[PDB]
Amino acid sequence: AEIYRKSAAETFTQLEATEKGLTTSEVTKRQEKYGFNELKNKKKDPLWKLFLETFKDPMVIVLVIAALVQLVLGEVVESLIIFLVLIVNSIISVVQTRKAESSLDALREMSAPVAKVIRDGSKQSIHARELVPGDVVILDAGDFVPADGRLFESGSLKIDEGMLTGESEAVEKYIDTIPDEVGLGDRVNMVFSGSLVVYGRGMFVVTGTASETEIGKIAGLLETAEAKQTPLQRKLESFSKKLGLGILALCVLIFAVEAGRVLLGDNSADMATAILNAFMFAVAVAVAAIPEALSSIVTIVLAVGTNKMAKQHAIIRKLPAVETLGSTSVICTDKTGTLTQNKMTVVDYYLPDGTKENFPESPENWSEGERRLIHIAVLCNDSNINSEGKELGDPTEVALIAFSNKNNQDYNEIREKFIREGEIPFDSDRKLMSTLHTFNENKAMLTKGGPDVMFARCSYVFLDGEEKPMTEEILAKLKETNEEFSNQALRVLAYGYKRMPADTTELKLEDEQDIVLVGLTAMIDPPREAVYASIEESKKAGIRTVMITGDHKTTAQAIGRDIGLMDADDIALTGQELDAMPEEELDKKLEHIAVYARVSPENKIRIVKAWQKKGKITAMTGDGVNDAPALKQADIGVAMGSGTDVAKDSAAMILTDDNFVSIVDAVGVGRTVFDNIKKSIAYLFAGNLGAIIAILFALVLDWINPFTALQLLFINLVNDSLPAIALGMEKAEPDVMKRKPRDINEGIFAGGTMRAVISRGVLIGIAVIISQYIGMQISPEMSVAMAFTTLILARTLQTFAARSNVQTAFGAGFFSNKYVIGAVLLCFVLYGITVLPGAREIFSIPASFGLHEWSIAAGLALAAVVMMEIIKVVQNKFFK
Numbered sequence: 027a028e029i030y031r032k033s034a035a036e037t038f039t040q041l042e043a044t045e046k047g048l049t050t051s052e053v054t055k056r057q058e059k060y061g062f063n064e065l066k067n068k069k070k071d072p073l074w075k076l077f078l079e080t081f082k083d084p085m086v087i088v089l090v091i092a093a094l095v096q097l098v099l100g101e102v103v104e105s106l107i108i109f110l111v112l113i114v115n116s117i118i119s120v121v122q123t124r125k126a127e128s129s130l131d132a133l134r135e136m137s138a139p140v141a142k143v144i145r146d147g148s149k150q151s152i153h154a155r156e157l158v159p160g161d162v163v164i165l166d167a168g169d170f171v172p173a174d175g176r177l178f179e180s181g182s183l184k185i186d187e188g189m190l191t192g193e194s195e196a197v198e199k200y201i202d203t204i205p206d207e208v209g210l211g212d213r214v215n216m217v218f219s220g221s222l223v224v225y226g227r228g229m230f231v232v233t234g235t236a237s238e239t240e241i242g243k244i245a246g247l248l249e250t251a252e253a254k255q256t257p258l259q260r261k262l263e264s265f266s267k268k269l270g271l272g273i274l275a276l277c278v279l280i281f282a283v284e285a286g287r288v289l290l291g292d293n294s295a296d297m298a299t300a301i302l303n304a305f306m307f308a309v310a311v312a313v314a315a316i317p318e319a320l321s322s323i324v325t326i327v328l329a330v331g332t333n334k335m336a337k338q339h340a341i342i343r344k345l346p347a348v349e350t351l352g353s354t355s356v357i358c359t360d361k362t363g364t365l366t367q368n369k370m371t372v373v374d375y376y377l378p379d380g381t382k383e384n385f386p387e388s389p390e391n392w393s394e395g396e397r398r399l400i401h402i403a404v405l406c407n408d409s410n411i412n413s414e415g416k417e418l419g420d421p422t423e424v425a426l427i428a429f430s431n432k433n434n435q436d437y438n439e440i441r442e443k444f445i446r447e448g449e450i451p452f453d454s455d456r457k458l459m460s461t462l463h464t465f466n467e468n469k470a471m472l473t474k475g476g477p478d479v480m481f482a483r484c485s486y487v488f489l490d491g492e493e494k495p496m497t498e499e500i501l502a503k504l505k506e507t508n509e510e511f512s513n514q515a516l517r518v519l520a521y522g523y524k525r526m527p528a529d530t531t532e533l534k535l536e537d538e539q540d541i542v543l544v545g546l547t548a549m550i551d552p553p554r555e556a557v558y559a560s561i562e563e564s565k566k567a568g569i570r571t572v573m574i575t576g577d578h579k580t581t582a583q584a585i586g587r588d589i590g591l592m593d594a595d596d597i598a599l600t601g602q603e604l605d606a607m608p609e610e611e612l613d614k615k616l617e618h619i620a621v622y623a624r625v626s627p628e629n630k631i632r633i634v635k636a637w638q639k640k641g642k643i644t645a646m647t648g649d650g651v652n653d654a655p656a657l658k659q660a661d662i663g664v665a666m667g668s669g670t671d672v673a674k675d676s677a678a679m680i681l682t683d684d685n686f687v688s689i690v691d692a693v694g695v696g697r698t699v700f701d702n703i704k705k706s707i708a709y710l711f712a713g714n715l716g717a718i719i720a721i722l723f724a725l726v727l728d729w730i731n732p733f734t735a736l737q738l739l740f741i742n743l744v745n746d747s748l749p750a751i752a753l754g755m756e757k758a759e760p761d762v763m764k765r766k767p768r769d770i771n772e773g774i775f776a777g778g779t780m781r782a783v784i785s786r787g788v789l790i791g792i793a794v795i796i797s798q799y800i801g802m803q804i805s806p807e808m809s810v811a812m813a814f815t816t817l818i819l820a821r822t823l824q825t826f827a828a829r830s831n832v833q834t835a836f837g838a839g840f841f842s843n844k845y846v847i848g849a850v851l852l853c854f855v856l857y858g859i860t861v862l863p864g865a866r867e868i869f870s871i872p873a874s875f876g877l878h879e880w881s882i883a884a885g886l887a888l889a890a891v892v893m894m895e896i897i898k899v900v901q902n903k904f905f906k
């Protein structure tokens with residue numbers, strides 16, 4: 027924050043080193059003191075730590091207590107089933123946590139393997155690991171920067187600072203000390219570790235190593251990035267705490283009821299039998315209320331959504347990440363490589379003849395001026411594309427010839443038509459290269475460079491021909507066009523041709539006057555064709571989009587206004603302004619600011635953290651290294667296929683096809699996934715509530731347990747899991763994309779879903795109560811069998827009613843959800859397996875369970891479902 031401001035001698039004196047180098051004793055003492063230039067990998071959570079962390083869930087705690095109670099009671103099989111369920115849930119959660127945590131290693135491969143360091147007066151290829159502040163490193167083209175440092179001798183050095191600015195653009199490096207504070211991407215006189223050197227030679231003095239570097243700061247932010255809780259995960263945690271409190275209250279009520287039946291009853295009833303009955307009732311309540319298959323069902327629905335969006339070439343590493351997309355309220359975005367294609371292109375153009383909007387794609391129909399413009403654009407080129415669009419040098423020349431080829435006019439044919447006869451490379455202050463290649467029977471010299479230099483050098487122009495050198499009207503029009511392009515943040519290069527000499531004798535400075543401007547071409551990183559549609563859909567979906575980019579203020583403003591991110595002539599927030607902004611000021615000015623420019627990776631993490639502080643599920647989407655801290659910090663991080671590997675790892679999603687529409691598609695798929703998950707959880711907990719009501723009513727009447735532990739485990743694991751998955755297979759709501767993002771504190775049972783849960787559970791419990799009463803009219807074992815049958819069949823047929831909370835199954839399509847019908851049929855098969863003579867004893871179903879008792883129980887379950895439909899109709903007609 028101060029090294030770049032200080033002079034080269036000042037920072038040399040600060041580090042106690044000279045330009046010659048440092049001795050071996052000094053370098054080894056400085057290596058032993060805060061040395062070891064490398065990104066220390068985080069030890070990260072071991073497997074056992076994650077295992078014990080997964081055991082802190084209230085549902086897991088209640089299930090563990092129930093399993094221990096069953097093991098003490100002698101129910102070895104049911105306790106082992108509960109233990110296996112807990113093992114499966116913990117394994118699933120730990121696997122998901124490991125997949126999320128795979129966003130590690132910080133990509134230390136970005137750091138250079140070697141480093142040309144002059145040590146003890148000798149130049150050696152010392153490995154970048156053994157580098158210390160004070161070490162003087164020589165840089166050349168194609169050499170990764172080993173450590174952060176300040177320039178003191180650099181000859182036309184250019185560094186691809188694509189891991190802070192996020193752009194593969196060769197940033198020019200000058201040794202002059204910066205007198206004023208500049209942004210992290212504008213530090214001209216300071217190299218940064220992990221940034222490739224594109225062109226030129228340089229030699230700097232290291233000022234930072236390991237975590238003190240900017241890539242070190244990025245690695246530190248990645249390591250300290252908060253493991254965000256998924257909105258489904260946080261809703262389930264809150265409802266799990268509530269359900270654990272409710273189950274503890276239910277067990278307290280059970281023990282109090284039994285203690286009352288003993289103390290207020292008679293001394294004949296032994297304490298041991300009553301306490302044993304209380305323990306069985308409490309463990310049955312725990313098993314029933316806790317959905318043992320809930321984690322598996324949620325994981326399966328999330329995997330279904332992940333596969334659905336992987337069909338669109340968007341790999342979602344984290345299973346809850348699709349849900350996190352569904353609950354997204356803010357989409358933070360990078361510009362270079364994420365909004366734009368990270369490929370410079372020519373978008374606009376101008377000639378004194380005029381501008382025909384879009385450049386014609388037919389060279390046969392091309393005008394003379396346009397043809398000469400393209401010619402003096404291609405034959406003066408520096409880059410090339412030969413195989414699979416391989417880029418030769420700077421993206422500016424690549425942009426020029428890509429625009430030339432995009433008009434169905436291959437540049438290679440023109441280059442072979444007009445052989446190069448000498449050229450001058452870039453001359454720093456002289457932006458004009460002015461190649462002197464011989465043309466077709468004209469021997470005209472062609473030039474290309476910056477706007478201002480071209481306009482100052484020449485006075486002629488190509489209006490219709492060799493126009494007389496007047497410089498008022500054409501100059502005004504040219505300047506107006508250039509200023510308009512600059513206001514559009516369009517990079518401008520002006521080209522011309524001179525032919526007076528027609529000799530081409532030497533290759534040196536020539537008559538830089540009278541180059542006869544024929545036109546100039548605009549240039550910018552254009553937004554992806556899918557970006558505008560994605561922005562329009564996100565705004566229609568209530569999701570605001572925020573641009574966080576390393577580009578200058580002008581380019582970010584132009585891109586935001588191009589895609590409708592900002593208002594008319596809005597003002598973006600520079601990275602410097604954000605750095606000078608206290609967190610309170612940023613929070614006060616967060617909704618109003620929609621585009622951030624010239625930001626550092628820590629600035630991106632700061633913006634994402636601030637947006638998450640406002641209770642909004644932030645969707646940071648990026649492709650560069652600078653986005654990786656923000657990708658990890660965001661609740662959902664979205665990467666691109668062409669983005670860097672660290673950005674792909676740090677982001678939950680990876681758009682392999684770089685389709686920005688896939689981001690809004692993921693938002694919609696996640697909304698549908700959360701609707702289906704809420705349907706499945708509502709169904710599971712309505713069945714659980716029915717079982718709980720039946721058990722409590724049996725308790726208060728001194729009745730036998732409606733369902734044993736094995737029966738409840740079977741229902742919750744194989745007879746509710748399949749219908750819950752089927753309801754997770756539900757079709758998308760018609761207005762799934764028009765809904766505002768769901769509240770982060772909405773709760774799992776909200777917006778009429780709690781009412782449906784309560785009604786369905788109450789009716790299921792009432793049916794099981796009536797069935798148990800009818801069974802007790804026969805025998806307690808018959809009561810258990812018929813209560814279990816009624817509960818299992820009511821929960822099987824509850825799939826139809828749980829499809830929608832306002833529209834009945836008869837009216838939403840009874841067979842529209844083929845998964846629901848398949849799950850209902852398979853649950854019928856499973857229940858028929860239960861009433862098999864061999865398996866009757868396992869499910870406490872006596873051999874006397876005749877077809878009359880089955881008919882009564884099945885009719886009670888069907889009446890429960892019919893009354894559930896009737897209650898749904900009464901609810902959506904009367905009160906909402």
Ligand code: BEF
Nearest residue numbers: 192361362575576
């Ligand atoms: F590469 Be970006 F636009 F931060």
Ligand SMILES: [Mg+2]
Nearest residue numbers: 192362363650
């Ligand atoms: Mg980028």
